[PDB]
């Protein structure tokens, strides 16, 4: 694919997301979603390798079904009140339809099935895009209509996402599927606090995005897509494995690392609304994510796996293209907790 | 989330089409222009939480204009009572309700 | 002139409907004759179910589809 | 929530203008020039009151003025007018363009019989002013009292007392 | 209840939807979608939407033609299925017809609420406007306002169509 | 829910309203600014480590740019955070003042008049 | 109503013609007569086997180009607006983008049939 | 100055259809911006009375508003009949 | 709500159920997608015509445009899948698991 065509398709994806986030008309939000999907399909197929065709087909079917449901919710809302502005969704049936459509777009359980498959089917750069930039538009729409979201349905889907991400990640040796299940669990954490405080949702989204960018850039630097391939990195770049272990610890929510800040900030918020059992279940369920991060840390950094003879050749060559924002990403994803009160700048 | 660039720049990308009481071509009005105008002027500036309670009368009138549920209920009741009165035969509807009227210009 | 005649025609049809309503629903438990459905007291344009509700199907078909079906 | 007030069948009685559409179109320009004042008074009442029940007398005066206009036309020369509106009425679109000789004859009769001057292109579509003694309605929409707004933000901005006050943070 | 024209058209619309949703051979699915498109055009015409109905019928006919061409190439299935050639397709078709009939019966004689609201029938002629004015078409004026009011819509739609051409040519490249 | 997005008089994308100039700016020796600079320095060290350069002394211009960028961004971030907290306190105090019936001043008894249950430890 | 009558009349006339065509003459149908025609010899495979489309990309492009004419058709009514400059700018913009898409497909060999 | 002439000659020899299309499209783009009749077209569109002109309540100090359609005040369409 | 509105809504629900229940062909599912788009067009047009929302009359046309972009997209994918398997059956899309 031509570099100019790639650049214009990336611009179209970000333009669809921006159109969703700056529009006050439901039709323009739907158009932004349509444009985003249209430009996103070829990005997943940049390398042909028919698994990418399967991933793109599954992604297209899921997103198009969600778009159809979204348009129906819009039309029902218009029918019961001649309103096109994005507001508290005067009709409840339309509100349920939109909640389900946005959950399907995000990949919340039980609409989560497509995420591991699509992430495994595409390249690491496409997975980075899909797991970071694609979450903004549905979450931005959900934040605008949060005052009308049925808490029961959203909290059920959030708990299901946390549980299913934690359980699904345990059985994975492929790194991309591990990232997908982590994404599902973090999505559940994001949407659990949305009906109570959208600033906490934005804070969790930002912290998750920086941690995910760090992890994906680290997996790009050492071209590993499996556990056994990542177990060879210590014999070529020990620093990369050390930073990967620290980032994995942060994603597990361990203090005093950055990943502890969202959960800590969410539980507290949920307690001010007299929600006690729910945060306790979510906090105990996140230990599954911690476990399957710790297993990867064991395989890649805390122990030394056997290597191969040809790795000696690789000792003579340096990484040519460098990611400039990787050091900032690692620092922001680990050493940021003391600056927690800065979250007030998000509201 | 919502980045209000239209408000910051005064651009009006899509706000012209949000409501039906907003500057139609050839000044063609919506079916419920007055009701929506009244509801909007009631609910302006007081917030959604206050508007949902204090402008409920205007919004209910606007919804009645939009869907006409009460009007259909009333007409259905009237026609049902008329059918009951005619089936046993003590109504005899007037000639101008049967087609024997003298029309006016 | 057309507006004046239209106003008189609509008002007369509404009045005839009201007079027939006063007779049809004489013995309905708590039916208030001529009761509006809107909280407001301003004029509201009739719905054509309010004007041709008590009339034959021919004039209803005319008033509804005569212009569309005319070719 | 209230009884809809309706006029009686007597109050809606009026002497009808029972001419056909082609007859009205043949005389449309002269009629618009001659009966302009009552027509504009009725239209101003209609667009200001937003209620047909409040402008019935103006409509009756409109009908009366139209009747006088047609009475004058019938009394002075009805043959040229009939010849004009017949050719107008033949056309399926009722085109002025196809009756220019009959229109000329009618105009020449009414110019000397009554002094009537046919309005030029652009005149009947002007926005005009109307002198009326009818008071301007105060609340035509029958609006309710608008709810009071949330009060205001007043005063100066001082630093937060003891900082953010978030858990152990002292700033 | 007057001439039942709108109700009959809507029922045929639903029947065509059931026909192509039972998923027989895509030839017959295209036929069912064409029938639904024509009937929906009729429905929209019965409400004063001449341009919109004709427009959607014209668009669908063209779209279906491409689908037929693609079906003959990639969805051929040596023994193509009709609605009575398989128990699954016939069962889905009968289920759709029965559900449509049950819903109509529940909403017709009585006034039942299925999901959102209820219905008594009364014919769709009740909710019309009575508006008597105009030397133009309101629908045509609203559609033509796209080039004066909807500049933003034209911009985004044109960019999307150009991107769609680029996108299809990228996807079908292969290599 | 969003608590202060719809605050009246708010400019959409300002990041620093005019009224914020009424507040004392953070000192340049603010420990939070020092932590911002420390984060920049750590980013520079990690950049040296990944690029396989002498970590402590490889690029002094690059490390200086890292520290300077972090401090520069952190200063405005601290200003916005302080302004937002001041706004929260201002609104809370105003709302308490304007709703006296909801925050009634209560005369407090002394511990010589309050009867607390005694629970022996035995 | 008149168009519905016209459609019913046309369909009825065509169906009646089919009925007379199938019920008036004498039919002698045997297996050899009704067999498929392939120039005197039996077909090798089925006619329901896949048939390759060499113009598939042009066929897909036809959908977008067909929606563009739906976008362009309200132009006679759009030419009556007061903001003539804006309407003309948007109409020319739409046509220019259509022409640019056609040019892009042409230059990248999108109009050539597959071999 | 000399390259464009050779390119145009080759295009006219090989693809006259494309040359004609580009010339006609360029003329369609440029000419409306240089024509004095575009303003006249806008004025003609503005002169068409699709809706009723609602009269104004005479407050007493609007000299430019007519009191009768045939009064000299108000917009004039004399420029149109001579066009 | 009149009977026409619930008939259109029922058509949408039927088309959604048809999409969500795959048989074998991807083309059948794409036809269900087009049917959902058509039901949305009819519903929105009926609402806009009934309420005389003049500007919104341009909305359904736009809705048609992005319908085609979805069809042309889907058809494109159907080509590529076919080129891999000689068949548009959805059972062949099973290289990636959960
Ligand atoms: C609440 C506040 C907080 C807000 C938070 C916001 C969200 C936070 C972040 C969200 C998540 C971020 C995820 C990033 C996705 C990255 C994906 C990617 O590109 O590949 C991964 C990439 C792959 O690495 P690689 O393997 O080494 O690269 C190999 C190549 O890909 C091999 O491929 P190649 O050979 O083809 O190489 C081509 C290469 C080389 O590129 C070139 O050669 C350049 C040539 C120029 C081509 C000319 C094109 C011009 C014509 C096209 C016109 C299109 C118009 C469209 C508009 C239509 C309008 C309707 O180009 C690229 O690789 C990608 C180009 C990227 C272009 C980006 C343009 C942005 C578009 C913005 C649109 C918005 C407009 C306004 C909208 C208005 C509404 C309508 O890795 C990274 O890039 C590292 C990650 C960096 C991400 C950024 C980190 C966070 C951001 C920090 C910055 C500050 C942000 C806040 C700013 C606030 C405002 C000031
Ligand atoms: C370069 C030398 C220089 O110019 O520094 C001058 C500067 C003079 O500042 P100062 O206003 O005269 O003395 C402030 C005192 O610390 C008086 O203390 P303060 O009232 O100003 O406290 C500042 C405040 C706000 O300051 C902070 O938020 C940042 C404190 C650093 C966090 C410690 C973690 C690693 C160090 O710290 C806290 O809120 C207490 C929380 C501490 C734990 C932070 C959460 C992390 C949990 C464990 C990991 O010295 C420093 O900033 C200390 C070096 C850093
Ligand atoms: C509240 C706390 C308050 C304090 C915070 C303390 C926390 C740490 C500091 C903040 C973060 C630091 C990040 C920057 C350093 C990263 C660069 C690096 O990789 O180190 C290599 C570098 C050695 O390389 P080299 O010297 O160039 O030549 C030898 C070759 O490179 C040979 O190198 P090689 O690559 O061939 O060696 C292979 C090795 C290479 O592997 C590594 O080097 C590991 C790198 C550490 C990963 C850092 C992750 C990001 C930070 C997150 C920390 C989390 C903190 C929370 C607590 C949990 C602890 C994990 O791999 C292994 O051996 C595998 C072993 C597996 C062990 C797994 C543990 C790793 C993670 C533990 C992190 C603990 C902190 C790191 C300490 C600094 C280093 O280390 C350094 O020399 C830099 C250390 C600090 C520089 C000091 C400069 C200051 C000068 C004095 C100023 C005086 C101040 C006052 C002025 C006025 C006085 C008069
Ligand atoms: C891991 C830590 C987070 C890293 C995030 C990226 C860091 C780089 C900084 C990003 C630069 C962009 C922000 C500065 C440009 C000006 C911003 C301005 O234009 O926008 C304002 C917005 O300003 C931003 O919100 C402030 C950005 C500050 C981000 C830092 C907060 C991080 C949380 C605390 C963790 C500590 C990390 C500190 C750094 C080490 C307008 O506000 P408003 O339109 O009305 O609200 C929008 C949201 N609403 C409507 C839904 C309410
Ligand atoms: C130009 C367009 C407009 C035309 C307007 C007229 C429309 C005409 C309708 C079109 C059909 C034309 C067909 C003409 C021949 C008739 C064929 C058939 O009807 O006759 C037999 C019908 O008879 C059946 O065998 C059964 C007869 C009785 C059983 C059912 C009928 C019950 C009706 C009661 C009859 C009792 C007396 C009624 C007095 C009114 C079937 O014979 P069959 O061999 O297959 O077909 C080949 C006909 N051949 C021989 C001429 C070649
Ligand atoms: C600040 C951002 C600039 C850089 C970022 C670019 C990203 C945006 C893409 C293009 C921005 C242009 C959109 C601006 C909105 C247009 C509407 C507004 O500007 O007014 C219109 C002005 O539009 C004019 O036609 C000129 C602007 C059209 C520009 C031509 C198209 C160029 C767009 C190219 C970028 C899009 C993506 C790439 C496509 C190739 C019409 O005004 P008017 O009709 O008086 O009054 C209407 C109200 N009435 C009806 C009540 C009377
Ligand atoms: C659109 C333009 C044309 C439209 C069609 C109009 C046609 C008008 C003229 C009709 C011609 C008369 C029918 C001639 C063909 C009939 C078929 C035929 O030839 O069959 C002959 C057949 C011989 O069979 P068998 O001797 O029993 O045994 C043979 C097997 N061992 O005998 C018959 O059955 C024919 C009986 C009478 C035929 C009917 C004629 C009546 C007129 C038909 C007009 C149609 C209007 C509808
Ligand atoms: C400035 C306004 C422009 C916008 C308006 C245009 C309206 C519509 C016209 C554009 C439609 C799209 C056209 C597609 C472009 C075709 C590109 C192409 O690939 O053409 C090549 C051919 O190469 C060319 O492009 C043709 C020559 C260059 C283009 C035409 C001339 C460029 C413009 C000339 C007119 C400019 C003004 C006239 C000058 C007047 C004299 C002073 C095709 O050749 P093959 O198919 O490979 O042949 C195989 C069989 N042998």
CSV table of C-alpha atoms in Angstrom, one decimal, chain A residues 134-294:
chain,number,residue,atom,x,y,z
A,134,UNK,CA,-11.0,3.1,18.5
A,135,UNK,CA,-12.3,3.4,22.1
A,136,UNK,CA,-12.6,7.2,22.0
A,137,UNK,CA,-15.8,7.7,20.0
A,138,UNK,CA,-18.1,5.3,21.7
A,139,UNK,CA,-16.8,6.4,25.1
A,140,UNK,CA,-17.2,10.1,24.2
A,141,UNK,CA,-20.8,9.3,23.1
A,142,UNK,CA,-21.5,7.4,26.4
A,143,UNK,CA,-20.2,10.3,28.5
A,144,UNK,CA,-22.6,12.7,26.8
A,145,UNK,CA,-25.6,10.4,27.5
A,146,UNK,CA,-24.5,9.1,30.9
A,147,UNK,CA,-27.3,10.9,32.9
A,148,UNK,CA,-29.9,8.7,31.1
A,149,UNK,CA,-28.0,5.4,31.1
A,150,UNK,CA,-29.8,2.6,33.0
A,151,UNK,CA,-27.2,1.8,35.7
A,152,UNK,CA,-28.3,-1.9,36.0
A,153,UNK,CA,-27.6,-2.8,32.3
A,154,UNK,CA,-24.3,-0.8,32.1
A,155,UNK,CA,-23.0,-2.2,35.4
A,156,UNK,CA,-24.0,-5.8,34.4
A,157,UNK,CA,-22.1,-5.4,31.2
A,158,UNK,CA,-19.1,-3.8,33.1
A,159,UNK,CA,-18.9,-6.7,35.6
A,160,UNK,CA,-19.3,-9.2,32.8
A,161,UNK,CA,-16.4,-7.5,30.9
A,162,UNK,CA,-14.1,-7.6,33.9
A,163,UNK,CA,-14.9,-11.2,34.7
A,164,UNK,CA,-14.6,-12.4,31.1
A,165,UNK,CA,-11.4,-10.5,30.4
A,166,UNK,CA,-9.8,-11.9,33.5
A,167,UNK,CA,-10.8,-15.5,32.8
A,168,UNK,CA,-10.0,-15.3,29.1
A,169,UNK,CA,-6.6,-13.9,29.6
A,170,UNK,CA,-5.5,-16.9,31.8
A,171,UNK,CA,-5.5,-19.4,28.9
A,172,UNK,CA,-3.5,-17.4,26.4
A,173,UNK,CA,0.1,-17.9,25.2
A,174,UNK,CA,-0.4,-15.4,22.3
A,175,UNK,CA,0.5,-11.8,23.3
A,176,UNK,CA,-2.2,-10.1,21.1
A,177,UNK,CA,-5.0,-12.1,22.6
A,178,UNK,CA,-3.6,-11.3,26.1
A,179,UNK,CA,-3.7,-7.6,25.1
A,180,UNK,CA,-7.3,-8.0,23.8
A,181,UNK,CA,-8.5,-9.5,27.1
A,182,UNK,CA,-6.7,-6.8,29.1
A,183,UNK,CA,-8.5,-4.3,26.9
A,184,UNK,CA,-11.9,-5.9,27.6
A,185,UNK,CA,-11.3,-5.8,31.4
A,186,UNK,CA,-10.2,-2.2,31.3
A,187,UNK,CA,-13.2,-1.3,29.2
A,188,UNK,CA,-15.4,-2.8,31.9
A,189,UNK,CA,-13.6,-0.8,34.5
A,190,UNK,CA,-14.1,2.3,32.4
A,191,UNK,CA,-17.9,1.8,32.0
A,192,UNK,CA,-18.5,0.8,35.6
A,193,UNK,CA,-17.9,4.3,36.9
A,194,UNK,CA,-19.5,6.1,33.9
A,195,UNK,CA,-23.0,6.6,35.4
A,196,UNK,CA,-21.4,8.1,38.6
A,197,UNK,CA,-18.5,10.2,37.3
A,198,UNK,CA,-17.3,10.7,33.8
A,199,UNK,CA,-14.1,12.4,34.9
A,200,UNK,CA,-13.0,9.0,36.4
A,201,UNK,CA,-13.9,7.4,33.1
A,202,UNK,CA,-11.7,9.9,31.2
A,203,UNK,CA,-8.9,9.4,33.7
A,204,UNK,CA,-9.0,5.6,33.4
A,205,UNK,CA,-9.1,5.9,29.6
A,206,UNK,CA,-6.0,8.1,29.5
A,207,UNK,CA,-4.0,5.9,31.9
A,208,UNK,CA,-5.1,2.7,30.0
A,209,UNK,CA,-4.2,4.3,26.7
A,210,UNK,CA,-0.7,5.3,27.8
A,211,UNK,CA,0.0,1.9,29.3
A,212,UNK,CA,-1.3,0.1,26.2
A,213,UNK,CA,0.8,2.3,23.9
A,214,UNK,CA,3.9,1.5,26.1
A,215,UNK,CA,3.2,-2.3,25.9
A,216,UNK,CA,2.5,-2.3,22.2
A,217,UNK,CA,5.5,-0.2,21.3
A,218,UNK,CA,7.6,-2.5,23.5
A,219,UNK,CA,6.2,-5.6,21.6
A,220,UNK,CA,7.0,-3.8,18.3
A,221,UNK,CA,10.6,-3.0,19.4
A,222,UNK,CA,11.2,-6.7,20.1
A,223,UNK,CA,9.3,-8.4,17.3
A,224,UNK,CA,7.5,-10.9,19.5
A,225,UNK,CA,3.9,-12.0,19.1
A,226,UNK,CA,4.1,-15.1,21.4
A,227,UNK,CA,5.3,-15.9,24.9
A,228,UNK,CA,8.2,-18.1,23.6
A,229,UNK,CA,9.3,-15.4,21.1
A,230,UNK,CA,9.3,-12.8,23.9
A,231,UNK,CA,11.3,-15.2,26.1
A,232,UNK,CA,14.3,-14.6,23.7
A,233,UNK,CA,14.5,-10.9,24.2
A,234,UNK,CA,16.6,-11.0,27.4
A,235,UNK,CA,19.4,-12.5,25.4
A,236,UNK,CA,19.3,-9.5,22.9
A,237,UNK,CA,17.9,-6.5,24.9
A,238,UNK,CA,17.6,-7.0,28.6
A,239,UNK,CA,16.5,-3.4,29.2
A,240,UNK,CA,13.5,-3.9,27.0
A,241,UNK,CA,12.4,-6.9,29.1
A,242,UNK,CA,13.0,-5.0,32.4
A,243,UNK,CA,10.8,-2.1,31.2
A,244,UNK,CA,8.2,-4.6,30.0
A,245,UNK,CA,8.1,-6.2,33.4
A,246,UNK,CA,7.7,-2.8,35.1
A,247,UNK,CA,4.9,-1.9,32.7
A,248,UNK,CA,3.2,-5.3,33.3
A,249,UNK,CA,3.4,-4.6,37.0
A,250,UNK,CA,1.8,-1.2,36.5
A,251,UNK,CA,-1.1,-2.7,34.4
A,252,UNK,CA,-1.9,-5.1,37.2
A,253,UNK,CA,-2.7,-2.1,39.5
A,254,UNK,CA,0.1,-2.5,42.0
A,255,UNK,CA,1.0,0.6,44.0
A,256,UNK,CA,2.9,2.8,43.8
A,257,UNK,CA,2.7,2.5,40.0
A,258,UNK,CA,0.5,4.5,37.7
A,259,UNK,CA,-2.0,1.7,37.0
A,260,UNK,CA,-3.2,1.8,40.6
A,261,UNK,CA,-4.5,5.4,40.2
A,262,UNK,CA,-7.6,4.6,38.1
A,263,UNK,CA,-8.9,1.7,40.2
A,264,UNK,CA,-8.2,3.6,43.5
A,265,UNK,CA,-10.0,6.6,42.0
A,266,UNK,CA,-12.9,4.6,40.8
A,267,UNK,CA,-13.5,2.6,44.0
A,268,UNK,CA,-13.5,5.7,46.1
A,269,UNK,CA,-16.1,7.3,43.7
A,270,UNK,CA,-18.3,4.3,43.8
A,271,UNK,CA,-18.2,4.4,47.6
A,272,UNK,CA,-19.5,7.9,47.7
A,273,UNK,CA,-22.6,6.6,45.9
A,274,UNK,CA,-23.2,3.8,48.5
A,275,UNK,CA,-21.8,1.1,46.2
A,276,UNK,CA,-19.7,-1.3,48.2
A,277,UNK,CA,-20.2,-4.8,46.9
A,278,UNK,CA,-19.6,-3.8,43.3
A,279,UNK,CA,-16.1,-2.2,43.8
A,280,UNK,CA,-15.1,-5.1,46.0
A,281,UNK,CA,-16.0,-7.6,43.3
A,282,UNK,CA,-14.2,-5.6,40.7
A,283,UNK,CA,-11.1,-5.2,42.8
A,284,UNK,CA,-10.9,-8.9,43.6
A,285,UNK,CA,-11.6,-9.8,40.0
A,286,UNK,CA,-8.7,-7.7,38.7
A,287,UNK,CA,-6.3,-10.2,40.4
A,288,UNK,CA,-6.8,-12.5,37.4
A,289,UNK,CA,-5.4,-9.8,35.1
A,290,UNK,CA,-2.5,-9.4,37.6
A,291,UNK,CA,-1.9,-13.2,37.5
A,292,UNK,CA,-1.6,-13.5,33.8
A,293,UNK,CA,0.6,-10.3,33.6
A,294,UNK,CA,2.8,-11.9,36.3
